[PDB]
Amino acid sequence: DPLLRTGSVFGGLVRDVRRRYPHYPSDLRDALHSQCVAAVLFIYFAALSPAITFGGLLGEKTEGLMGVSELIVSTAVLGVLFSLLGAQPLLVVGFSGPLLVFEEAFFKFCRAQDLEYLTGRVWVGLWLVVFVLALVAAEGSFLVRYISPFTQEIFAFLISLIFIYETFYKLYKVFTEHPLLPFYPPEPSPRNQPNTALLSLILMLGTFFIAFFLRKFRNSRFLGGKARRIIGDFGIPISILVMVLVDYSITDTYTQKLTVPTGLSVTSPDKRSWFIPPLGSARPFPPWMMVAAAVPALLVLILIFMETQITALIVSQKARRLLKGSGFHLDLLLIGSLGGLCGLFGLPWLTAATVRSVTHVNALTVMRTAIAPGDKPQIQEVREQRVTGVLIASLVGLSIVMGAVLRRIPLAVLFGIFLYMGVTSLSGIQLSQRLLLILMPAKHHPEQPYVTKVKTWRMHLFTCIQLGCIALLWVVKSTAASLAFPFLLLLTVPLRHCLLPRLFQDRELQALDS
Amino acid sequence: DPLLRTGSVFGGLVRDVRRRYPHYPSDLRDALHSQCVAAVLFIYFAALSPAITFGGLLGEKTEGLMGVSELIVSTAVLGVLFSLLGAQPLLVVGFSGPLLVFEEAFFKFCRAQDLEYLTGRVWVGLWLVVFVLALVAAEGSFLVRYISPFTQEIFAFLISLIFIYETFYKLYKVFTEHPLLPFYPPEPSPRNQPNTALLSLILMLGTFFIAFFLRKFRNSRFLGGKARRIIGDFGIPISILVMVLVDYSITDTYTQKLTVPTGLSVTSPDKRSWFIPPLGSARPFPPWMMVAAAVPALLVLILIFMETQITALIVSQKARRLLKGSGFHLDLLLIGSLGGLCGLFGLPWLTAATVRSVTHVNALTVMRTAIAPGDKPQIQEVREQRVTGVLIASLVGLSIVMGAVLRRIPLAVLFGIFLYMGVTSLSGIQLSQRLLLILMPAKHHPEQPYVTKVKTWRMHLFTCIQLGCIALLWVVKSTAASLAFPFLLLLTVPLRHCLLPRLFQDRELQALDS
Lengths: 514, 514
Ligand SMILES: O=S(=O)(O)c1cc(NCS)ccc1CCc1ccc(NCS)cc1S(=O)(=O)O
Ligand SMILES: O=S(=O)(O)c1cc(NCS)ccc1CCc1ccc(NCS)cc1S(=O)(=O)O
What we know:
2 copies of one chain form a homodimer. Chain A folds into 2 domains: 33-180 and 188-368 and 375-428, no CATH class; 429-514, no CATH class. Chain A has 23 helices and 4 strands. Helices cover 61% and strands 2% of the residues of chain A. With 514 residues, chain A is mostly helical. In chain A, strands 1-2 form a two-stranded antiparallel sheet. In chain A, strands 3-4 form a two-stranded antiparallel sheet. At the A-B interface, helix 8 of A face helix 8 of B. One copy of the ligand O=S(=O)(O)c1cc(NCS)ccc1CCc1ccc(NCS)cc1S(=O)(=O)O is lined by residues 49-50, 53, 96-98, 100-101, 162-163, 166, 170, 477, 482, 485 of chain A. It is classed as transport protein/inhibitor.
């Protein structure tokens, strides 16, 4: 019962520490195997590229005040610290879209009001630290028990769908950069090149298909058990290596490759330095902003809380075989304090990543080798340790001095890897199965509790409600009011706890929503 | 059994006619369904393109004396006649590689000895007719009982492997004429075009994958049974239509398309006419060639007999549920007489096609709708009728006046269709399963009679012997002694009936070889 209120200050944090910290030698010892290496290799590529993309976008939006190096430094430091001190070291911290939206809006507000951007960020971080400490002190992390699988399913489905849509847009943009033309006259990124877009499509599809086939090969009967396990562990590294070699063999055509800033330096050394004075560099900071910086701190707190808590709820589900423990009080305090302290150095705030953490947990899941003939395998154990997160964060940080190797890796292989990750992420959601059940006839439905105890027409209405909520949420972030997305997401708890029982019966709700 | 000798002249032919001909109204009536349309649409494309390819090759080899229109006319006429009068109307007649080799060798011999080519072909055809009549009269078609599944599996495996290899050398060739170049300066088939090879590869892979996925969709649970059956029947037409539409949407890039001669005319109207005088056109024909034309007739008879009889053996296997009957005496007489009469008009000889007939039978197989969960589907029936062959031959003949539609179909879609056909053809051979069994561990082998009653190491030796025979046969036709391939193939019957019992036991041979 980690969500029970004790009535004493710092009680939940004390319970979390006392529950988790004794297992530390086990955490250090569990990581000696070959699956951890494959997980590290996969998740390092899964985590490095979003840093580059969001650093480029941030540099575009904030006129070069924050760039790629800032995001890389923040990711490395925060990930290392959280993995070393967290109670759930299987979470992956990084930048996300809502944080980018908030940063852009805050930059617009600061520019409109003739204020300094980084000093305002500093005071926002300080107020966020104060608010997070106050919230943790009052055991405010017990509201998580009010978050039903309704909201969790909606959030996960929307996040994975958005992830998938963005990979396809970045391929489309390749083809508009390099259209297929009848004539290519002979001649600052290259433009209007032949054989580029089709080769990128081929590389993406090949990487995806090799990864899928090697994943399917695990449950076959060919070769020995040890060889099957080893080959299935390293399916994604094998796909990446094979497609990189295929791309390297062809030396006539231009393909876009990974680029990283070289050296540890700020993006714009003339405009700013590493340390941001809290009282102002060129102008005094007015005290009224010093006082009024609480509201953006409140918005950041709401964003970080909702994201981290929903991710922690999804990761620690009972069907996923999580044993060593869970952290609902320590992780929030760690993330909030580190984010608030990051403001003094002009570094962006971070949160828990949903797709990356889910993929990290999936990569470490061990299935039973005694697979029943013609039966779906079941989870044997999940390996819990602290080495993988530290190694991933260290590699992300050290990627700055490893640009020579990274310049040989095309982006289409990473596009295929992202497609594989997004497709795999959608298979662990009950909404996916209840959406597949719509196409099949009613006489072929499995023996799930929401099939036998609920009428067929009364079960499809729940799925329709969830789909409508997801569509409304996507429509709202598409527009310019995307800053109100978290409030709209938290609004689904009153909907389930006040309006849903008025339509459905308690028995139906107990089986459908569990 | 139809393989028993009666002791009277024309006894086997009389028995075959009396067994098969009463079912004629059933043969005409069985064709009223939707699967026949899909089979016709698939096999028409399966049959038309080899005529074009072999017509081009024949025109190259014979200096334009025989071309594409001659092959089309021969295919149409012989197919229509055989389907109307045959006892096994599920066979598909057409040109093959061995026939091309014989024609090239005969042309070389005629050129070296200063003789006319078509008159020699006329006399070869007449001697072939005489030999076929003599062989059929003496009940010589009872030697087919000495052809064990050893030879049948060897032949089928080799033929399918060659088919697949040739589909990948015509894409390699497609890439070779259109290499990927850094620069494409603007400047008789087009050459050195951009975006052609990669687009052809994409079209091939897309057609193959759509066909495979739609074939897999048959055994799923989505949608109703009727919709599943209808969609699975038309998987290959749907793949072809979708990929043709995709290619048509892109109008910037050059792709090679189907071309057919227009009008009904001889390839070289100046050199020859439709009728070949048997006494000589420009020079008298020496009687010594008139007498000595028996040996090439013997070679042609051996080739046609072996190919047609092996194909008929493979098609009429007991596991394939053939009911209306089989023809071992009527089909040989029909094919031999029609081929011999074809010589007078300067048309090439035809034989039964293995891959095309196997695909034709597979396309008309009906599987039981009561599919057991987690179990292989069972064959319910095979639709035996005469309409499909007549329609396919008529369409092949009429394709001359339908070039406008045919010019919009790229060849890469057909390459993908050929790959699908070749892959599907290899799944009905026991050698395929016994070759898959090598990779799997000995504790996972099924309960087939060649597993339980034979030691594991003693069964792998039979597969090695078969593979060595196949490799030797392929090596022999690669070289210039490919005219002796049929003799080498028939040499495998003494090997099985004289040498194999000296090594294996009676029980081992009975279990391993049917
Ligand atoms: O976070 S994602 O990995 O899906 C992502 C990937 C790319 N490119 C390939 S790494 C580009 C953008 C995104 C995230 C886009 C996004 C997601 C959620 C929200 N919520 C807004 S309240 C907003 C965005 S936004 O950046 O398009 O505004
Ligand atoms: O008969 S096939 O459909 O495999 C074929 C197809 C193509 N091109 C695409 S339709 C080209 C050639 C062939 C057949 C080649 C062949 C097959 C068997 C033999 N054995 C007789 S000794 C010989 C040949 S050959 O034409 O290469 O000599």
